[PDB]
Amino acid sequence: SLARAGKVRGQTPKVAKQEKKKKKTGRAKRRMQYNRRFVNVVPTFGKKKGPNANS
Amino acid sequence: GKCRGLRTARKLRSHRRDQKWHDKQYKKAHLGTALKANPFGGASHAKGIVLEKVGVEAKQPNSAIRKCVRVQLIKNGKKITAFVPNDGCLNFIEENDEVLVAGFGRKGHAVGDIPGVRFKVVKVANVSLLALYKGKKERPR
Amino acid sequence: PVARSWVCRKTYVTPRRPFEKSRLDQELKLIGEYGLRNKREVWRVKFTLAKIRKAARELLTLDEKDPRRLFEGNALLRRLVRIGVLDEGKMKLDYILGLKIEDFLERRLQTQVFKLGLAKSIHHARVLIRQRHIRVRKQVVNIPSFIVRLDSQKHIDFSLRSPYGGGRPGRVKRKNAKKG
Amino acid sequence: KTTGFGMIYDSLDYAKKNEPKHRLARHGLYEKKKTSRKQRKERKNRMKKVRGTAKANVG
RNA sequence: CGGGGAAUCAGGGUUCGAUUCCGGAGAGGGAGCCUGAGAAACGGCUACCACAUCCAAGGAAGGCAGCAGGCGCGCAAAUUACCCACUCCCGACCCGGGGAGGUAGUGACGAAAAAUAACAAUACAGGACUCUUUCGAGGCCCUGUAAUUGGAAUGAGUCCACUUUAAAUCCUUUAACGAGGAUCCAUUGGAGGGCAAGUCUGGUGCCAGCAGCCGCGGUAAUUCCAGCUCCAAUAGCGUAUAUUAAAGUUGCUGCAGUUAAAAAGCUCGUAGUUGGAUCU
């Protein structure tokens, strides 16, 4: 009774990953992280927004 | 209270070791009865033969059937139950298969919903379950 | 038995807490200020400074006229003056505990190439050092973590074999000039 | 710079008597045997198995 | 096996030390010898015990816990390579010999250094200095989006040669070739809390599964399976296990014993521990 195996993984529709531009690595990536968090800062009255904040 | 004399060294160290034997982790490590009841026999991993596939029922608040396997270890002949983690990964296992098993993370203690499982399957037929699940490699038989 | 030496150290320590926002921000600020590859360079400089301060704090426990304290203290003070972190006026064992990580990061070859106008950016300075365009006195130095001594700072040059130095323009200019 | 070591002898006879054979062979003044180690080890054991003037026959 | 020592550690401590240096022990297990200055020696002998090789069936020959290598065992560990050039050792010896040792091969045990791109011009965008009541006007820097352009510098590799070396290889030195993003494309884990980073979208519907712990999933799932995005470390990152600190949860420093685990029913009493002033 019951005991399916791989039910949901075999159910879910296969969506292909989109082809995107590659990420910078090493010192360049740390430079981009620094310039995004500490250089071009936008002032905020309460600062309630995260980096992955959507809606 | 405690003895605090300048000649009380052997009293202090003798009482220390006698009350050290009352520590649970110390008695697990040093008495040597838990090490012989341990199926792995002081090993990080063991390698065994799949005897059968088991649906283990999850404990009271959670309702699920966890896919486990009864394995007999090669080096001592003891029988254990090992959990097959990801979904559909029991289908990569057949009966009488060569399987590498590790502990599950709590040092011989059962973990989470699964009642009485201390072990998980790491490798099946000398290829990892991770590479089979992510589809990097193929399995022989 | 083999004729081999097995002496080796680790030049950094991993911090105690994995995810603390203040430490992450401070280390990323250091990386951005000095153009460093990862957190491990920050941790390496921090470990060097911690070793120096532990040595000084071990020295300060002895009597002021102790011979070991005097000898090791003047040795440590001269070593910290020669790299340009301490000054001659403040050459005392108590001032060593007032040292910063940013004091040691100014002494790297990357920072000194950027400050002397040889490069126009700190990242450009790291590139130029790695590209074998920078020499110190006469040796070509390829390491950006090269700590510049105080007597060695006054002559950092462009390594005459480089295109920015004496001559012999590189691969791209030779290919582009050989078009017509 | 390139840094090396150099020696000037008084005559060629002293040079032949005092240089290692391999630095003489770089100038063509020495010839090494072409036999490897394993060949003469096995030959030594094979002639260890035999006795007398018959030792020189095996090889 | 013991030390020298190692990991961790405020201070005190805990744990490890088969392992290259010093000492001991033993060559399948025991036992007895010969030679010799030195051995109860095993790349010496003689037995018995257990294994096991060639047989013409009478006999004969064994000992890798040396170097490679093989089987077996297992979670678990490398080439049946080259040299006596270096270091030393032995001999009748400046000459011979050394799987000692050296050199290469395998090697993400572990440690050190360190790429994966930088810059310039433009189009937006900020933050400043001057002039303006303000709006604004500029020549001052900075930032990425660049479905925008531009040549310059390169190491990876390809590969003459020299150098290295016993002979090589590698490193270093160098001719020649070698860079525009569909590349010479960086991974491993995670995104409810602890603990840094989504109440995004689709699918599933107490199923499949996730989840160290608390918990999530029974039709709006921030936790499953995916896509996008984001976070951490980064040539590395997971997981299992032993151990150390967290543990003032073994407490000498430094814990507790009314009600939370805990003071013997009571007294005597030997060893043990501790023991009042006082002498210049």
Short mmCIF file of C-alpha atoms (C1' of nucleotides) in Angstrom, two decimals, chain E:
data_model
loop_
_atom_site.label_atom_id
_atom_site.label_comp_id
_atom_site.label_asym_id
_atom_site.label_seq_id
_atom_site.Cartn_x
_atom_site.Cartn_y
_atom_site.Cartn_z
"C1'" C E 1 56.21 -0.89 22.45
"C1'" G E 2 58.47 3.49 25.76
"C1'" G E 3 60.47 8.39 25.20
"C1'" G E 4 61.94 13.01 22.05
"C1'" G E 5 57.22 14.78 20.48
"C1'" A E 6 51.66 16.23 18.29
"C1'" A E 7 46.61 18.33 18.17
"C1'" U E 8 43.76 21.55 21.03
"C1'" C E 9 44.04 25.22 24.77
"C1'" A E 10 42.88 32.34 28.41
"C1'" G E 11 45.00 30.09 33.13
"C1'" G E 12 44.48 25.13 34.73
"C1'" G E 13 43.58 20.99 31.48
"C1'" U E 14 42.00 16.95 27.71
"C1'" U E 15 43.55 13.69 23.99
"C1'" C E 16 47.09 11.53 20.62
"C1'" G E 17 52.15 9.46 19.82
"C1'" A E 18 52.13 2.08 14.65
"C1'" U E 19 55.03 6.36 11.98
"C1'" U E 20 61.81 8.39 9.35
"C1'" C E 21 65.50 10.57 15.88
"C1'" C E 22 67.13 7.56 20.60
"C1'" G E 23 66.10 2.85 23.16
"C1'" G E 24 63.62 -2.22 23.07
"C1'" A E 25 61.49 -6.57 20.62
"C1'" G E 26 60.90 -10.06 16.52
"C1'" A E 27 61.61 -12.44 11.50
"C1'" G E 28 55.07 -18.12 10.44
"C1'" G E 29 55.27 -20.31 16.13
"C1'" G E 30 58.24 -22.31 19.87
"C1'" A E 31 63.12 -24.64 20.95
"C1'" G E 32 68.48 -25.91 20.42
"C1'" C E 33 72.92 -24.54 18.41
"C1'" C E 34 77.78 -23.79 14.91
"C1'" U E 35 81.07 -19.94 13.48
"C1'" G E 36 82.76 -15.60 15.48
"C1'" A E 37 85.41 -10.03 19.08
"C1'" G E 38 80.26 -9.59 18.67
"C1'" A E 39 74.17 -13.50 17.21
"C1'" A E 40 70.67 -17.97 20.93
"C1'" A E 41 71.50 -14.49 14.05
"C1'" C E 42 67.02 -16.53 10.60
"C1'" G E 43 68.53 -12.80 2.79
"C1'" G E 44 73.11 -19.12 8.92
"C1'" C E 45 72.20 -24.34 10.53
"C1'" U E 46 69.20 -28.41 13.14
"C1'" A E 47 64.35 -30.11 14.94
"C1'" C E 48 59.14 -30.31 16.15
"C1'" C E 49 54.23 -27.62 15.15
"C1'" A E 50 51.36 -25.11 10.98
"C1'" C E 51 51.58 -24.07 6.03
"C1'" A E 52 53.46 -24.92 1.29
"C1'" U E 53 57.04 -26.03 -3.97
"C1'" C E 54 59.29 -29.84 -7.66
"C1'" C E 55 58.78 -34.90 -8.47
"C1'" A E 56 60.43 -40.26 -12.79
"C1'" A E 57 57.08 -41.68 -5.97
"C1'" G E 58 63.18 -43.03 -4.43
"C1'" G E 59 64.18 -38.07 -2.89
"C1'" A E 60 64.99 -32.63 -2.98
"C1'" A E 61 64.17 -27.62 -1.57
"C1'" G E 62 61.44 -23.55 1.73
"C1'" G E 63 60.39 -18.46 5.16
"C1'" C E 64 59.04 -10.45 1.48
"C1'" A E 65 56.94 -7.57 9.72
"C1'" G E 66 63.78 -5.69 3.07
"C1'" C E 67 62.70 -3.11 -2.37
"C1'" A E 68 58.98 -3.30 -6.16
"C1'" G E 69 54.95 -6.51 -7.04
"C1'" G E 70 50.51 -10.11 -6.15
"C1'" C E 71 46.43 -12.47 -3.42
"C1'" G E 72 43.52 -11.90 0.70
"C1'" C E 73 41.58 -8.47 4.04
"C1'" G E 74 38.99 -4.38 4.32
"C1'" C E 75 36.12 2.50 4.77
"C1'" A E 76 41.25 2.65 4.27
"C1'" A E 77 47.16 3.33 1.37
"C1'" A E 78 51.67 4.24 -4.96
"C1'" U E 79 56.09 1.64 -10.12
"C1'" U E 80 57.56 -5.78 -10.67
"C1'" A E 81 61.21 2.32 -13.22
"C1'" C E 82 66.66 4.60 -13.30
"C1'" C E 83 71.53 5.38 -10.63
"C1'" C E 84 75.55 4.42 -7.27
"C1'" A E 85 76.50 11.23 -9.41
"C1'" C E 86 75.13 13.17 -3.81
"C1'" U E 87 75.03 11.11 1.73
"C1'" C E 88 77.54 7.50 3.90
"C1'" C E 89 78.81 2.18 4.89
"C1'" C E 90 81.69 -2.49 3.88
"C1'" G E 91 86.17 -4.91 1.72
"C1'" A E 92 92.68 -7.09 0.63
"C1'" C E 93 90.40 -1.34 -1.23
"C1'" C E 94 91.91 6.24 -4.40
"C1'" C E 95 89.64 1.43 -8.57
"C1'" G E 96 84.80 -3.06 -6.48
"C1'" G E 97 79.74 -3.35 -4.15
"C1'" G E 98 75.23 -1.20 -1.75
"C1'" G E 99 66.23 -1.78 -3.66
"C1'" A E 100 70.99 1.72 2.37
"C1'" G E 101 70.16 6.35 0.20
"C1'" G E 102 69.45 9.33 -4.14
"C1'" U E 103 66.36 10.38 -8.79
"C1'" A E 104 61.89 10.09 -11.48
"C1'" G E 105 56.38 7.61 -11.66
"C1'" U E 106 51.53 7.43 -8.72
"C1'" G E 107 49.74 11.21 -4.92
"C1'" A E 108 43.52 17.22 -3.87
"C1'" C E 109 47.19 13.32 3.35
"C1'" G E 110 48.62 17.95 4.57
"C1'" A E 111 51.25 22.91 4.08
"C1'" A E 112 53.15 27.63 1.11
"C1'" A E 113 52.58 31.02 -3.32
"C1'" A E 114 48.99 32.16 -6.84
"C1'" A E 115 45.18 32.99 -12.85
"C1'" U E 116 40.17 33.01 -14.45
"C1'" A E 117 41.01 39.31 -16.90
"C1'" A E 118 42.69 45.37 -16.48
"C1'" C E 119 42.13 50.10 -18.83
"C1'" A E 120 40.30 54.29 -22.16
"C1'" A E 121 36.16 57.03 -24.76
"C1'" U E 122 30.80 57.53 -24.88
"C1'" A E 123 24.83 56.90 -22.80
"C1'" C E 124 22.37 56.93 -18.49
"C1'" A E 125 23.14 57.21 -12.68
"C1'" G E 126 24.86 59.06 -8.06
"C1'" G E 127 27.96 62.04 -4.60
"C1'" A E 128 31.03 66.71 -4.17
"C1'" C E 129 33.56 72.20 -5.43
"C1'" U E 130 32.16 77.15 -7.76
"C1'" C E 131 28.32 80.61 -9.39
"C1'" U E 132 23.07 81.31 -8.51
"C1'" U E 133 16.81 83.50 -3.75
"C1'" U E 134 15.71 78.85 -5.87
"C1'" C E 135 15.26 76.09 -10.32
"C1'" G E 136 19.55 75.28 -12.24
"C1'" A E 137 24.87 75.92 -14.94
"C1'" G E 138 29.71 73.67 -15.12
"C1'" G E 139 35.98 70.74 -15.83
"C1'" C E 140 35.53 66.81 -10.13
"C1'" C E 141 35.39 61.96 -8.94
"C1'" C E 142 32.67 57.22 -8.66
"C1'" U E 143 29.46 53.18 -10.12
"C1'" G E 144 27.56 49.33 -12.75
"C1'" U E 145 23.70 48.30 -16.98
"C1'" A E 146 26.61 48.41 -21.15
"C1'" A E 147 21.57 43.31 -25.96
"C1'" U E 148 28.20 50.33 -26.93
"C1'" U E 149 32.77 50.62 -29.03
"C1'" G E 150 38.44 50.48 -28.83
"C1'" G E 151 43.28 48.53 -29.14
"C1'" A E 152 47.17 47.16 -25.63
"C1'" A E 153 49.35 43.44 -21.52
"C1'" U E 154 49.47 38.72 -20.80
"C1'" G E 155 49.86 33.72 -18.59
"C1'" A E 156 47.63 28.75 -19.50
"C1'" G E 157 48.90 25.69 -23.41
"C1'" U E 158 51.81 24.52 -28.50
"C1'" C E 159 56.86 24.13 -28.70
"C1'" C E 160 63.26 25.21 -31.15
"C1'" A E 161 67.29 25.76 -27.86
"C1'" C E 162 70.19 26.57 -23.51
"C1'" U E 163 70.30 25.48 -18.41
"C1'" U E 164 69.31 21.18 -14.70
"C1'" U E 165 71.05 15.80 -14.13
"C1'" A E 166 74.71 9.79 -13.54
"C1'" A E 167 71.18 10.33 -17.85
"C1'" A E 168 66.82 12.78 -17.78
"C1'" U E 169 62.07 15.24 -16.26
"C1'" C E 170 60.41 19.56 -13.57
"C1'" C E 171 61.42 24.70 -12.10
"C1'" U E 172 64.11 28.96 -14.04
"C1'" U E 173 65.93 31.56 -18.91
"C1'" U E 174 64.38 32.17 -23.79
"C1'" A E 175 63.14 32.28 -29.99
"C1'" A E 176 58.08 31.36 -32.73
"C1'" C E 177 52.62 30.63 -32.18
"C1'" G E 178 48.88 31.44 -28.63
"C1'" A E 179 42.27 36.34 -25.80
"C1'" G E 180 36.32 39.17 -27.00
"C1'" G E 181 32.78 36.99 -24.19
"C1'" A E 182 27.92 31.29 -28.26
"C1'" U E 183 35.58 31.54 -24.70
"C1'" C E 184 41.07 29.71 -22.65
"C1'" C E 185 32.97 29.27 -20.05
"C1'" A E 186 34.75 27.65 -11.17
"C1'" U E 187 32.80 24.74 -8.21
"C1'" U E 188 30.58 22.88 -3.56
"C1'" G E 189 26.72 23.70 -0.34
"C1'" G E 190 22.59 26.60 0.96
"C1'" A E 191 18.12 30.81 0.89
"C1'" G E 192 11.85 29.66 7.92
"C1'" G E 193 14.95 30.15 12.75
"C1'" G E 194 19.91 28.97 14.93
"C1'" C E 195 22.76 31.15 10.49
"C1'" A E 196 24.22 35.23 5.54
"C1'" A E 197 20.71 35.08 1.62
"C1'" G E 198 13.08 35.08 -1.80
"C1'" U E 199 6.53 35.43 2.13
"C1'" C E 200 9.09 35.06 -6.53
"C1'" U E 201 6.89 31.52 -10.31
"C1'" G E 202 5.43 26.41 -11.88
"C1'" G E 203 4.49 21.19 -10.14
"C1'" U E 204 3.05 17.90 -5.99
"C1'" G E 205 -0.88 17.65 -2.28
"C1'" C E 206 0.79 14.35 5.45
"C1'" C E 207 2.21 11.74 -1.15
"C1'" A E 208 7.03 12.18 -2.92
"C1'" G E 209 10.12 14.01 0.06
"C1'" C E 210 13.04 17.86 3.19
"C1'" A E 211 14.64 18.35 7.96
"C1'" G E 212 21.97 17.68 12.72
"C1'" C E 213 17.48 20.45 16.28
"C1'" C E 214 12.84 23.19 16.40
"C1'" G E 215 9.83 21.81 12.43
"C1'" C E 216 7.83 21.90 6.79
"C1'" G E 217 4.40 18.87 3.38
"C1'" G E 218 -3.14 17.16 4.49
"C1'" U E 219 -4.57 22.91 -2.65
"C1'" A E 220 -2.15 30.85 -1.50
"C1'" A E 221 4.41 25.13 0.65
"C1'" U E 222 9.34 31.65 2.43
"C1'" U E 223 11.40 24.49 4.06
"C1'" C E 224 9.73 19.15 -0.99
"C1'" C E 225 10.86 18.86 -6.88
"C1'" A E 226 12.38 22.54 -10.59
"C1'" G E 227 13.31 27.76 -13.17
"C1'" C E 228 15.10 32.57 -12.03
"C1'" U E 229 17.48 35.29 -8.45
"C1'" C E 230 20.37 35.72 -4.09
"C1'" C E 231 24.06 34.14 0.04
"C1'" A E 232 28.90 31.74 2.06
"C1'" A E 233 33.75 29.84 1.12
"C1'" U E 234 36.38 29.51 -3.22
"C1'" A E 235 40.60 25.60 -6.56
"C1'" G E 236 38.04 24.10 -3.44
"C1'" C E 237 33.61 22.61 -0.91
"C1'" G E 238 30.31 18.72 1.24
"C1'" U E 239 29.24 14.19 4.27
"C1'" A E 240 30.48 9.94 8.03
"C1'" U E 241 33.55 8.90 12.21
"C1'" A E 242 37.61 9.54 16.33
"C1'" U E 243 39.12 13.65 19.17
"C1'" U E 244 39.81 18.94 21.30
"C1'" A E 245 37.56 23.71 22.67
"C1'" A E 246 32.65 25.15 23.54
"C1'" A E 247 31.86 21.87 29.12
"C1'" G E 248 32.11 26.14 35.63
"C1'" U E 249 27.81 19.40 31.73
"C1'" U E 250 34.00 15.93 36.03
"C1'" G E 251 34.77 21.72 38.56
"C1'" C E 252 42.78 21.78 41.60
"C1'" U E 253 41.94 26.66 39.69
"C1'" G E 254 36.14 25.87 39.42
"C1'" C E 255 30.28 22.74 39.90
"C1'" A E 256 26.42 20.70 42.83
"C1'" G E 257 23.44 17.82 47.21
"C1'" U E 258 15.47 22.35 51.27
"C1'" U E 259 11.69 22.03 47.09
"C1'" A E 260 14.89 20.40 40.47
"C1'" A E 261 19.59 14.25 40.19
"C1'" A E 262 21.69 14.08 45.07
"C1'" A E 263 23.48 13.92 53.12
"C1'" A E 264 24.58 7.31 54.93
"C1'" G E 265 18.81 5.64 60.37
"C1'" C E 266 22.35 6.62 64.24
"C1'" U E 267 26.88 6.56 67.05
"C1'" C E 268 31.89 4.57 67.91
"C1'" G E 269 36.30 3.82 65.49
"C1'" U E 270 41.68 2.19 62.51
"C1'" A E 271 44.40 3.63 58.17
"C1'" G E 272 44.05 8.70 55.38
"C1'" U E 273 43.57 14.06 55.66
"C1'" U E 274 43.94 18.31 58.89
"C1'" G E 275 45.53 20.18 63.55
"C1'" G E 276 45.54 26.63 69.00
"C1'" A E 277 49.38 30.60 71.33
"C1'" U E 278 54.75 30.40 72.50
"C1'" C E 279 61.60 30.79 71.91
"C1'" U E 280 65.83 37.70 68.56
#
